[PDB]
Amino acid sequence: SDHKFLTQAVEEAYKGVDCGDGGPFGAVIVHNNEVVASCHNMVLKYTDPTAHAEVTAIREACKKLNKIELSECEIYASCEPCPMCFGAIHLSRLKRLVYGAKAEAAIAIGFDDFIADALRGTGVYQKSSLEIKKADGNGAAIAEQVFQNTKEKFRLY
Amino acid sequence: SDHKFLTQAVEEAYKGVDCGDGGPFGAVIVHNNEVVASCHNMVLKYTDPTAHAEVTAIREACKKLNKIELSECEIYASCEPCPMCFGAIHLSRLKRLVYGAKAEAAIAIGFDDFIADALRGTGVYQKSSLEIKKADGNGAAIAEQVFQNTKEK
Ligand SMILES: [Zn+2]
Ligand SMILES: [Zn+2]
């Protein structure tokens, strides 16, 4: 099941960058195998620097479910969530995070060096409690290739 | 001026908690000396756990200026911004943050221990770039008093 939803997140990333909504990032929020929200980065479309894929999905899922906690839901992120997004995942009380590519894969094509200490377990003040799964196998390889694929698609533009 | 805009962020904190929009937290974004956004926590009003005062203010300022970066603006927060909000402040590229109450003041009234390493200078992977000012004196007194004053609210 993890492979299904992670690949849905990756496809959101491709769709969002293709239509110009934002960068190549996707996120899917799922409640007992039912998809609650399927989003990509909307920073450009919304003129909102907080509209990352994860934040957008959280906003949508909370509005759909009429509550500010998503404690029975899980989130699939095509890329490792940044500090803002990991903070939003913490605040939302999501029970599990599965992510596809390490942040280094995005930094490799020029994205900002902007990594969540609490995700990687390197903080003094901020600690995480939720279950975190870095994908492996086919899902991880597919997720990691998003960034070189996007850079190649826009190389001569 | 620093006192003026921090006091306005505290005023937003009180207004928001009084009308049930969210918790006792406010934020003000200014371009030199003009208010670009003045907001409070809207978590309850919007059913949105990301709608902290700072995030709400960033979104409104970016809409007002029609752009996703706020490198000419500064942000005043009634309370120390949390990891989410400090991340948002980084992404928006605000050039300066002034905040009134240390997170311990909110925690002492029963809010979650949820503190940004990058703001306190203890981040390993996340390093702040912007200038940060913790208020002192009367500004700190005003911002700390919010939590005692709104305890039963
Ligand atoms: Zn993010
Ligand atoms: Zn916050």
Plain-language structure description:
2 copies of one chain form a homodimer. Chain A has helices at residues 2-19, 43-46, 53-65, 83-92, 103-107, 117-120, 137-153, and strands spanning 26-31, 34-40, 73-79, 96-101, 131-134. The first copy, chain A, has 157 residues and is an alpha/beta fold. Chain A has a single domain (1-154), classed as 3-Layer(aba) Sandwich (Cytidine Deaminase, domain 2), CATH 3.40.140. The first copy, chain A, has a 5-stranded mixed beta sheet with strand order 2-1-3-4-5. In chain A, helix 1 (2-19) packs parallel to helix 7 and helix 3 (53-65) runs parallel beside helix 4. The longest helix of chain A has 18 residues, at 2-19. The first copy, chain A, is globular and about 45 Å long. At the A-B interface, helix 3, helix 4 and helix 6 of A face helix 3, helix 4 and helix 6 of B. One zinc ion is lined by residues 52, 54, 81-82, 84-85 of chain A. Residues 52, 54, 81-82, 84-85 of chain B line the site of one zinc ion. Chain B: The active site is at 54 (proton donor).
* Biggest sheet details of chain A: 5 strands, mixed
State the share of residues found in helices of chain A, binned by percent.
Answer: 40-55%
Portion in beta strands of chain A = 15-25%
Count of domain modules of chain A: 1
Quaternary class:
homodimer
Q: Largest beta sheet of chain A: what is the strand line-up? A: 2-1-3-4-5
The CATH architecture classification of chain A is 3-Layer(aba) Sandwich
CATH superfamily of chain A: Cytidine Deaminase, domain 2
Shape of chain A: globular
Largest interface: A-B, 37 and 36 residues
Count of helix runs of chain A? 7
Q: What is the name of the CATH class of chain A?
A: Alpha Beta
